[PDB]
Design a binder for these strands. Sequence first.
RNA 1: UUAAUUUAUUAAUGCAAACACCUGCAUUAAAAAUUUCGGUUGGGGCGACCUCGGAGCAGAACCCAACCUCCGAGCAGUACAUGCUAAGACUUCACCAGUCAAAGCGAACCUUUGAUCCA
RNA 2: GCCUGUUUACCAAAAACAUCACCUCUAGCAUCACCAGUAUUAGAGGCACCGCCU
RNA 3: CCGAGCCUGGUGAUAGCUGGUUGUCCAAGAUGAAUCUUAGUUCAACUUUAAAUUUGCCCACAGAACCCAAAUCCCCUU
Lengths: 137, 338, 52, 95, 41, 95
Amino acid sequence: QDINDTVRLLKEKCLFTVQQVTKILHSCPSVLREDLGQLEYKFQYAYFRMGIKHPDIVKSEYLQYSLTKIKQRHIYLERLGRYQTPDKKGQTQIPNPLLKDILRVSEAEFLARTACTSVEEFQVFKKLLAREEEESE
Amino acid sequence: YKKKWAATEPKFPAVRLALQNFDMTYSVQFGDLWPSIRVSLLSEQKYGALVNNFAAWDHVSAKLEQLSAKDFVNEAISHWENLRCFTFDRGDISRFPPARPGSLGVMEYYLMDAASLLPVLALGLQPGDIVLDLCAAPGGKTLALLQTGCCRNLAANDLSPSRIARLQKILHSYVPEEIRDGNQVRVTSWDGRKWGELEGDTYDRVLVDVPCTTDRHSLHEEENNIFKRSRKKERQILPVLQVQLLAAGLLATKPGGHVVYSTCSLSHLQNEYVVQGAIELLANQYSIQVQVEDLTHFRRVFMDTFCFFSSCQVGELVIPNLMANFGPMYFCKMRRLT
Amino acid sequence: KNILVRMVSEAGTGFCFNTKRNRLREKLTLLHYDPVVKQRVLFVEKKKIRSL
Amino acid sequence: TVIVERWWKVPLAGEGRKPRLHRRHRVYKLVEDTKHRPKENLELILTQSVENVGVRGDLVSVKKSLGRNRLLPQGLAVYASPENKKLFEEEKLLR
Amino acid sequence: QKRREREQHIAECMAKMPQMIVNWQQQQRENWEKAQADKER
Amino acid sequence: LTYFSARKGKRKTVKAVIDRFLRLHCGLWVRRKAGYKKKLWKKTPARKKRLREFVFCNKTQSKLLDKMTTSFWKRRNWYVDDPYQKYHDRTNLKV
RNA sequence: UUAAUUUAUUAAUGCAAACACCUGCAUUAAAAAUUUCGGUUGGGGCGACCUCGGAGCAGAACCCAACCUCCGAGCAGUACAUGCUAAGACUUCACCAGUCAAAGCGAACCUUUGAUCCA
RNA sequence: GCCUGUUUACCAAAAACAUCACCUCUAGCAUCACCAGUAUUAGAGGCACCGCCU
RNA sequence: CCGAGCCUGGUGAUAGCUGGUUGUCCAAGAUGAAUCUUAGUUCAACUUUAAAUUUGCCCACAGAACCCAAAUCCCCUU
Ligand SMILES: [Mg+2]
Ligand SMILES: [Mg+2]
Ligand SMILES: [Mg+2]
Ligand SMILES: [Mg+2]
Ligand SMILES: [Mg+2]
Ligand SMILES: [Mg+2]
Ligand SMILES: [Mg+2]
Ligand SMILES: [Mg+2]
Ligand SMILES: [Mg+2]
Ligand SMILES: [Mg+2]
């Protein structure tokens, strides 16, 4: 049942093709461990708030990364103005950084090339965001 | 009325409209500092704690220091040459416990933006100096001025009866009956633009905190957001009101007296053009000369607690930073030479 | 803001009356006239009724 | 069994008259479904030796499923009626 | 029974009441004295 | 209201009136003041006293209530210890 | 349709129930079903307003509109008799509601918002 | 607009619809359609013959 | 006579909307509040009838604010 409902979430409520679902379960089976609801939130974060499409999600294994890390980096970029949610037309004033540049890279290169900020600033932002999530709950 | 239209505007919320305005202006203004300022504005705000000099000041300072906050004000007057505001170290995000009524019956401390205290410390309140607050009635700087000495007289004016009532509330909460009833505190609700005529060359130290775009609160709160599309006309006329209020303050201050123009916005338009236009208008329409006093020493003194934008030629700009989310705050010191 | 609180007689009577006190203020103890006892007695705040 | 209850009370009909029902009296709330009740046991009198229950003539509380599927259909047990109890009582006292 | 339980509880509380009133007033006055001592410093 | 019921052909009573108003036999209607139990903490003592009172109705209000109730509610009731027994009749009324 | 209300019905699951099939109960969907489209103002827009109060129009009892000209408020401070009762009155043009109050009793010696039902 | 075709019987025959071609998605299977079929199959959607460069 | 057929029935659907509402004669009879409300309604005011008993209108003098005109209100007489 757990496997079936994970796959059904990936297909029905996430609109991943069958081949995409096999690719996800092949690259990162940790999705199966990850509980429903949290997985749906992660995918919708990629889709709506981040503006990523299924091909890119699967290509970058976005589902592999943790939601806390994903938020910590994306919200930092967004508030910094280096990342913009694509509009209704799917366009942005400035091209967004690539997901490989956002999540795959380490904190050093992430803050040096994509954000161009300081590690201390990033730590402060991470703590602030943790407090924000705590308050939101 | 024409019901159907070919195209309608996107219908942005006021917060997003303010963000777009800031992105299109402050980005140019600040270059590479704009992303940092933007993230600081969008993140939480760092609140300083101003102890109430009319309460158990030593006990409250001890409690805050136990909470590990330090009085940045204390170790600043030494180099600059009663006010005590405790703030956490750069990078620390620790909050201050909510203020509670003290043993004397007054609130122990006021949680206020530490940036909205530099204008007070730069006005240079000398003992026995008559003080005016032309429009500053959010509390804040006003209460800071009040908690400066027991041998000084201060008047606070603001057109808005609601804001005057707010000042009264904080006064009853913090200022004791002795000082509040005494003439030391004189509150009024009149128009500052005509304050030059109402009183001229009367006050020695003036604080003109003109109504501003209050960028941080504009991004935070949707209610009464100055950047709502309908209220564009008021937004556009804000510079005129700011110039008029600063001119009224410069007229009311005594010859040789001092004024501090204050703003809670990053806009160069509302920061430096306001002061320059006020100087020009008040030197032509009134033939009164005003000199802008340097605060570079003040900048260096408070560099540790605040980050300042240096490119601003006139005045001082506390820009918010993630390490110290205290800004924004623009303040300019002006001495009336005639 | 202020909160409406139920001051309950310390005289053992079931008598209670509602007062208004600041939320940040300490819990209230107040002399008040108890009709049943017919004498001024202490009343202690028991519980917060509402926030106003 | 599904047990239901009218949401709307039916006005009394009388002694010999029959209650008159209306559209609102066809609305029900499920007060209980008996199938979800905790299982009870069946009292049976054994006739043949059966493992882990008894030998013969001893009243036994067996799960209704077992009693109705194995014991009774196969004749290994009989209902604990008063008649069966009496007959097995004479059987016991005749030994 | 309920009436007499109420009556006896009221009697006990009334017996204690003047002492409690005096103690509360004394506590308020001593708090005010402490405030003045703090003002003196 | 219902001037002719579908089952009896009679005039019906608006029970919302019966739940709110007292009829004194002479023809007067008594009522409570609206809001007499609402947010008393913000009402001055005089306002609370005014609100805690039992109040008579207009002539037109009384006529409306008379129309909305049937003759059963407009009869003499000899209750045991009615607090309104004295108020059920008028005295020294000139026109 | 990201309007409101539902999931009866199907499809999934889960829990019981009978030892694949089926019944009941939940959850999520799909499919649908029912129902609504406040008011005043604004021709070249991208809305504003809706309750209460102060000033002028409306000069002198009361009363008087507007897309009319201006301003203000959604409470606080205080105390905790800021209690209870009660003649007689006012009243926002109705009602609802809202005001004032002698005498008396009891302690002492105050200055705006909203009904009913329902909980 | 690839084409021949279709359409608003009764105001529109068209550039609209369909169309071979191509792409995408779904399906591993039998006794009432699909189908007495089985991935070179079937269902659905998009696009538009075709051909050349990016 | 298809943005959802036709017939029968529910059905005398509902309509704050339009139209119509038939003998004679006399008499009295005219310009606020709330409301999913301004094409309506309820209360008031006005209006009609009947009844009770006793003042009603007009109305001079006296009287009705400081701040900063025409008149009005009130009522002995008449
Ligand atoms: Mg009236
Ligand atoms: Mg063609
Ligand atoms: Mg045709
Ligand atoms: Mg044809
Ligand atoms: Mg033709
Ligand atoms: Mg036909
Ligand atoms: Mg009809
Ligand atoms: Mg006539
Ligand atoms: Mg309504
Ligand atoms: Mg209508």
